[PDB]
Symmetry: C3
Subunit: 282 residues, 3 copies
């Protein structure tokens, strides 16, 4: 009786741009002039095909490389396989997804479903080190039929020391009301390992971050080590068993949190108030 | 026919102190003058509520922050939410736990059960870097009804380069007799990633460290990467299939083990002897 | 109808040598003069016993230490337990394995099955830092009855910055034809954490890297953080859903991949061609 994903299998078309931003960053967007860091969420159902008409509006070569989804070598997004895009150029990248199922040999083919991500592979170096650092990364979600759908999805990227390329002490913060079903996509990039920690909430360390029932032995956690290009996701009920509050999330590596890269999960009562949080003190 | 945890649901009261130790460390204890590093184990059943009458006997502010368990924002243990404790002060922290169960929307709420930990959040920095470094950390276990109970529980904390804040070449060692059911709570703190390795024994990488039966596909391991504020636990049968012996455990990062931070799991025959281990050579 | 492992339980005998190589490395082999880095794969069935007649042909002490399998303390491979081997010496190491099963107390004993590894424990330091760095490491696979068997098994070791001790830009590459069932054993050694990434393919994060059916909630991944002495393995169908191609694998830590330690999974059509791969350009 929660909302759930339907069966997939449609062909989808989408336009994407890589742009240099006024402050020197680089971002992806669905419209020229509306690039963001992280780039926009792409969400499909297992079985869907996605044709991305990608335009590089920058003055250097750029590409689009995706984790997890099915792509032929011509949509690798690498210079080696001649899959990047010249300045001002356009290229159609195709990502496919499949449902799980029994193979002819009796084995089980896993589906595409999961929390994934896309990023540049040619800016700065042949592994996209400069593009990733500048902001060319974004999330991808592939739903299995029957997966629970959230009220809202927030993307948190640990990129080197930053969260979502933001300066220390600037969040990002996310807001919810007690009881909302909130989804988090958690991606890591760059040079360092991290440990993602969330106060007041916990999730299962498995594909969906949710336990299906009493037979799932997955660890329930509130702290998870991650490294460059790791992605996972989960859903929580905001404030469940703990109430409204300004619930911190941050990397738990002590020098990293001490740098001031922290955010708040601001869980409100219906009247918008948050116990112990005065907005004028923030 | 092994002992198992009963159904929870009782209200428990406990006193805790933070104290400066004569050697400059800081520790938690259940009694004044009996602080330890790591702090004392707290063990409850899912459904229990714990009211901790906490007294800060130090000359600087200190707090108590817990992973995993349910707490309202007023027991956050952070300065931001005005949840720390002035020098000489007292505060009651409340931790709650819940059993798993079906929500009204048909989804499955995960329970509190697991291997968790508590630590300071305000000594030295606003993330407790100095308190953690000085020794203000300890383990928490939440049992699910029917969980197997051990003969004994040992806590191993990788804190920066140390084990349990001890100097190189000083253990800690733990002792058992062949056949004992031994539980390990494994916590990591500080700045570095580690890989916990145990000779002669292995466990399952899931919630309890134990496989329930033949249908659990979890990896069976003897080596596990960890990062700051990670916690996991497991149970082993001492010497099972391998016999008595001085079984090393250590971080497998080569420069870390080469520093001499290592311990021994001393598994004895009934007569107390250990093959290949002469106590006078140690 | 894929090939599967039979029930184990045989006693096996094998000879192994540690040798200094002409270029200054050190390797294990099954025959004098045929040491390799990584050392040769050892593969057994749960229940098998392996007696290894090990000869150290080097001028320094060396040993053989294994993860995961059952060994008594006399086959620890450590100097502390007098289990290493003098220059020119010989020693028989015994590794045992067991099937999973119900204990007398009603609990479930996990079997030995998994992806494991062996390495030196005394060259350079008392934890084998020099031996490991020089190349004394190799893979071990223990099969459970009914496990799916591959067409071929490839071993990938992240040893400090190198792959299999090879220089940057020298692979190693592995070849397959579209449709082959390919097994990867992935081991990490040394000082650093890594993230193993494979283009165009994905696997399950569980014991076998394969989902048994629709009830397994394990995350499906193409990127995995690892640390020193971690081991895991998986099987993929070469080119499944993605076609022939030169599919990169590499560490995704950006400075590591930028050093040029990368390899190719060269997936061919039957005529041996690879789209977008010209052999003369490589
Ligand atoms: Cu790549
Ligand atoms: Cu961090
Ligand atoms: Cu916390
Ligand atoms: Cu990537
Ligand atoms: Cu915190
Ligand atoms: Cu370590
Ligand atoms: Cu070992
Ligand atoms: Cu913490
Ligand atoms: Cu060891
Ligand atoms: Cu690496
Ligand atoms: Cu990739
Ligand atoms: Cu080892």
């Amino acid at each position: 009786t929660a909302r759930t994903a339907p069966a997939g299998g449609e062909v989808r078309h989408l336009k994407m741009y890589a742009e240099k931003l006024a402050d020197g960053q680089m971002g992806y967007g669905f419209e020229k002039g509306k690039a963001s860091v992280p780039g926009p969420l792409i969400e499909v159902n297992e079985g869907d095909t996605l044709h991305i008409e990608f335009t590089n509006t920058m003055d250097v070569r750029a590409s689009l490389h995706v984790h997890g989804l099915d792509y032929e070598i011509s949509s690798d997004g690498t210079a080696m396989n001649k899959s990047d895009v010249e300045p001002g150029g356009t290229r159609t990248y195709t990502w496919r997804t499949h449902k799980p199922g029994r193979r002819d040999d009796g084995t089980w083919r896993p589906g595409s479903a999961g929390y994934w991500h896309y990023h540049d592979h040619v800016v700065g170096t042949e592994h996209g080190t400069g593009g990733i650092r500048n902001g060319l990364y974004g999330p991808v979600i592939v739903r299995r039929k029957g997966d629970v759908l959230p009220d809202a999805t927030h993307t948190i990227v640990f990129n080197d020391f930053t969260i979502n390329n933001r300066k220390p002490h600037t969040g990002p913060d996310f807001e919810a009301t007690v009881g909302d079903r909130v989804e988090i996509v958690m991606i890591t990039h760059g040079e360092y390992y991290h440990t993602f920690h969330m106060h007041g909430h916990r999730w299962a360390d498995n594909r969906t971050g949710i336990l299906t029932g009493p037979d799932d032995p997955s660890r329930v956690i509130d702290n998870k080590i991650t490294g460059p290009a790791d992605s996972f996701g989960f859903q929580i009920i905001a404030g469940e068993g703990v109430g409204a509050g300004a619930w911190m999330y941050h990397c738990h590596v002590q020098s990293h949190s001490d740098m001031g890269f922290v955010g708040l999960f601001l869980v409100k009562k219906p009247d918008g108030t948050i116990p112990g949080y005065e907005p004028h003190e923030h």
